[PDB]
Write a protein that binds this DNA or RNA. Structure first.
Ligand SMILES: [Mg+2]
Ligand SMILES: [Mg+2]
Ligand SMILES: [Mg+2]
Ligand SMILES: [Mg+2]
Ligand SMILES: [Mg+2]
Ligand SMILES: [Mg+2]
Ligand SMILES: [Mg+2]
Ligand SMILES: [Mg+2]
Ligand SMILES: [Mg+2]
Ligand SMILES: [Mg+2]
Ligand SMILES: [Mg+2]
Ligand SMILES: [Mg+2]
Ligand SMILES: [Mg+2]
Ligand SMILES: [Mg+2]
Ligand SMILES: [Mg+2]
Ligand SMILES: [Mg+2]
Ligand SMILES: [Mg+2]
Ligand SMILES: [Zn+2]
Lengths: 116, 60, 127, 83, 152, 99
RNA sequence: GGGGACUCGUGAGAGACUGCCGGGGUCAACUCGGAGGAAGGUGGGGAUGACGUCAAGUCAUCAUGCCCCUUAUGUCCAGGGCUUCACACAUGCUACAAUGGCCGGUACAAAGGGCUGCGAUGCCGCGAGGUUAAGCGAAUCCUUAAAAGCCGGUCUCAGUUCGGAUCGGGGUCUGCAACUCGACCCCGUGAAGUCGGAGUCGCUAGUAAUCGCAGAUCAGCAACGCUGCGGUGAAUACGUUCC
């Protein structure tokens, strides 16, 4: 029972299980289930082949998921980098890009302490 | 404050968003109450002197 | 001339109309269970009328307001005690000994400048 | 100005300094201070000497810098790795 | 303090079980002012104990408390160039307080799912004399015994 | 009949009350229906400022500004009474409005 | 409509003084315990800082003695900076979950703000929001839905339906203007973190702990700061050896 990835964690309800798709969160999962017809309170174990085929087509009909979405994100980042903008410069330097504070924080953009 | 800045504030500036309030008595730019037009200092001395009707020390 | 009293606990005010009847609580159109579902509250109210007497008898309906549920419960307790004193003064010593006629002055202490709360202070941190 | 009811924002002095040249030729550097102007799909091929606080930097609007600002290609601060 | 003892506060009987023991229990479980939640947890634990043993829950609780209550504590002191433990008697109300604290503290860190069943299991094991709460009392007694020399 | 309304406001007690019941209550001899002064809840504007001119944040001082409101009376719009109402003048510390 | 009953609003008063009783004490101060009382020994809290100390802080609130500048160290303007970042410290917020997360229903506050303003209702939008517009300088209108709480359902101990950083895309509003450098909304992304070494902090009761609300500054930025307001509501104090 695979959509693109495995997406069949052992004994998960369908709305939560769908979030394991890279590109679907809770809201996307809720509208997927509402659109197809499968109820949220239903385990991924008890999913039929026809239910799977219904919810399969509808994700590439509308949404964007593993692979192409991951390509588009890095495409945007790379475009910013070689266009020569301020955000791209900060992407190259490995610094926060949305105007954060770098005096005492930014420990996610930077790694752990380097202890000069 | 400086008299040039006090005059500039009193005037009518370009881009009305630039208008800011200064203390009506001393010309302080910071901590100016709208209801009095005074800074916190000048407010404190005037209130103690009793020159501000209705204002008095507060205990509760 | 009905027996009307009042009781206050923190900021809640309860107006009681102690009245002869079967024994029943009406709390702006609700029963005692509807308004105060907590058993501790249900004991706190009608603790006074059972501390001596008596015991499930003539009913009450009272207006509620202000404070929180526990404060309203305490205010209702005080109002019931005051109403019982008014309607039958003989058991005044009993309720006074039980301590149900004290208004219980305990208000929220005001915040104080330079502190996080009424007493809580920021970390001292010598050096 | 950053809301889809008023369109993009360009300074009028910058617009009338580019639209009375692009109609005939790709004008050389336009010395300007208007970092806050967004690049519209008419600055293509032009070049701007944008102020950075101390000097003017030439920027060539090619194709993809059509939604950003003139200032984003004129860095103001200088940091070079304390050590 | 320095100016003698302070007045302690009184408690009222629990409505469903006419005891102050369960009132002290709910006040030990209470956190963040959630007294209704603490009462729910205690009531659920007592009901699970009753449904598992048949016996009256407050009687089971009294048995558990009698099992875990200590008699000698080990207050520390320093004399010269060394500090060593001094065994002293425990007064009854402090013993009850300490036993309740031990029960709740050790049930909070039991390997189960909900606090209701954690606390019920801890109470049953204590009443049987098996739990870590009983182990704590035994360790306290052993340490008070192995230091009788310093009973000045 | 139920037309004229008064709106006394003042910064201090001991002025608004007297300014009402010994100045506006001179219409009882004129023959006007008065319900008397009706005290409205007092207002409190508060301010908290730093005492020092520099750098001592933890030392502050509070100030109030109270407003007292009463006499919303419903005197009859008799033309001879309104004569006295408008020809009487009162302390400035008390503010009076006619509705 | 009406009523003066209840609350409340705001004015004037009463009340608490060891006043009364028992014991102690030079019969004195005073102390221990009772009675009556809403309250009992300073009822709780606030305002209130003696003589002085630290050549403590402020010449950047203001004032001011001497010194210094006067095509500049005065004054105007546009961009930039005050927001940097191998690190270090300090004060906080959010967490590491089941006394919990999410969903559905439902109850109970106080104190404040509002004409260059608050926008009820209706219509559009998933939402931030857009438009029309009743009423309201306000105990009468808006702010106003308090949240924890209670009931039910689900999740079943997992780096998770915990956590919400970072980043991608698309937007709303304020403002001449949102790149440097605004807040907020939607979709996606889902990091560290599984309770914290030596050490160290606050708190004795409506306190601590926890939950929301309001104001000032303010075009916007404060639901992490400050000043306040209420809701729920504990555990301990043997004692003065030690710090
Ligand atoms: Mg401004
Ligand atoms: Mg509080
Ligand atoms: Mg000095
Ligand atoms: Mg200095
Ligand atoms: Mg000066
Ligand atoms: Mg000077
Ligand atoms: Mg400038
Ligand atoms: Mg700064
Ligand atoms: Mg979550
Ligand atoms: Mg909910
Ligand atoms: Mg709608
Ligand atoms: Mg998660
Ligand atoms: Mg990890
Ligand atoms: Mg875990
Ligand atoms: Mg430690
Ligand atoms: Mg603001
Ligand atoms: Mg903070
Ligand atoms: Zn001033």
């Amino acid at each position: 029972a695979r959509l693109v990835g495995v997406d069949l964690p052992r004994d998960k309800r369908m709305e939560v299980a769908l979030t394991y798709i890279f590109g679907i969160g809770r809201t996307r999962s809720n509208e997927i289930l509402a659109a197809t017809g499968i109820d949220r309170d239903l385990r991924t174990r008890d999913l039929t082949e026809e239910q799977l085929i219904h919810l399969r087509d509808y994700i590439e009909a509308n949404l964007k998921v593993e692979g192409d979405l991951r390509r588009e994100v890095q495409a945007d980042i790379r475009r910013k980098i070689e266009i020569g903008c301020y955000q791209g410069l900060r992407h190259r330097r490995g610094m926060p890009v949305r105007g954060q504070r770098t005096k005492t924080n930014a420990r996610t953009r930077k790694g752990p302490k380097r202890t000069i | 404050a400086k008299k040039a800045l006090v005059n500039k504030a009193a005037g009518k500036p370009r881009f009305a968003v630039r208008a800011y309030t200064r203390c009506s008595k001393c010309g302080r730019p910071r901590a100016v109450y709208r209801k009095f037009g005074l800074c916190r200092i000048c407010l404190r001395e005037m209130a103690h002197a009793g020159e501000l009707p209705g204002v008095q020390k507060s205990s509760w | 001339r009905p027996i009307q009293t009042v009781g206050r606990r923190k900021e809640a005010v309860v107006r009681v109309r102690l009245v002869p009847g079967t024994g029943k609580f009406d709390l702006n159109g609700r029963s005692l269970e509807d308004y105060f579902p907590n058993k501790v509250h249900q004991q706190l109210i009608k603790a006074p009328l059972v501390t001596v007497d008596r015991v499930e008898s003539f009913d009450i309906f009272a207006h509620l307001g202000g404070g929180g549920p526990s404060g309203q419960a305490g205010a209702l307790r005080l109002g019931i005690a005051r109403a019982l004193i008014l309607v039958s003064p003989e058991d005044r010593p009993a309720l006074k000994k039980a301590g149900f006629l004290t208004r219980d002055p305990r208000a929220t202490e005001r915040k104080k400048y330079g502190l996080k709360k009424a007493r809580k202070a920021p970390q001292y941190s010598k050096r | 100005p950053r809301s889809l009811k008023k369109g993009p924002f360009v300074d009028e002095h910058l617009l009338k300094k580019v639209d009375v040249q692009n109609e005939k030729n790709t004008k050389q550097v336009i010395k300007t201070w208007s970092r806050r102007s967004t690049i519209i799909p008419d600055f293509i091929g032009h070049t701007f000497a944008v102020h950075d606080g101390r000097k003017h930097v030439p920027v060539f609007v090619t194709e993809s810098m059509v939604g950003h600002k003139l200032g984003e290609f004129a860095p103001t601060r200088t940091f070079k790795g304390h050590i | 303090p320095r100016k003698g003892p302070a007045p302690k506060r009184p408690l009222v009987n629990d409505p469903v079980y006419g005891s102050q023991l369960v009132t002290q229990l709910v006040n030990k479980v209470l956190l963040k002012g959630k007294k209704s939640l603490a009462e729910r947890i205690v009531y659920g634990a007592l009901e699970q104990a009753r449904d598992k043993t048949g016996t009256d829950p407050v009687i089971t609780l009294k048995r558990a408390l009698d099992n875990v209550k200590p008699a000698l504590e080990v207050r520390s002191r320093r004399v010269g160039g060394a500090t060593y433990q001094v065994p002293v008697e425990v007064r009854p109300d402090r013993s009850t307080t300490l036993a309740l604290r031990w029960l709740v503290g050790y049930s909070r860190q039991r390997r189960e799912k909900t606090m209701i069943e954690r606390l019920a299991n801890e109470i049953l094991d204590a009443s049987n004399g098996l739990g870590a709460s009983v182990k704590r009392r035994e360790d306290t007694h052993k340490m008070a015994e192995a230091n009788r020399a310093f009973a000045h | 009949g139920q037309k004229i309304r008064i709106r006394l406001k003042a910064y201090d007690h001991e002025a608004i009350d007297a300014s009402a019941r010994k100045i506006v209550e001179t219409v009882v001899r004129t023959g006007a229906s008065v319900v008397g002064p009706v005290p409205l809840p007092t207002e409190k504007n508060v301010y908290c400022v730093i005492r020092s001119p520099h750098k001592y944040k933890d030392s502050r001082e509070h100030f109030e500004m109270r407003t007292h409101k009463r006499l919303i009376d419903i005197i009859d719009p008799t033309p001879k009474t309104v004569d006295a109402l408008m020809r009487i003048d009162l302390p400035a510390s008390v503010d009076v409005n006619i509705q």
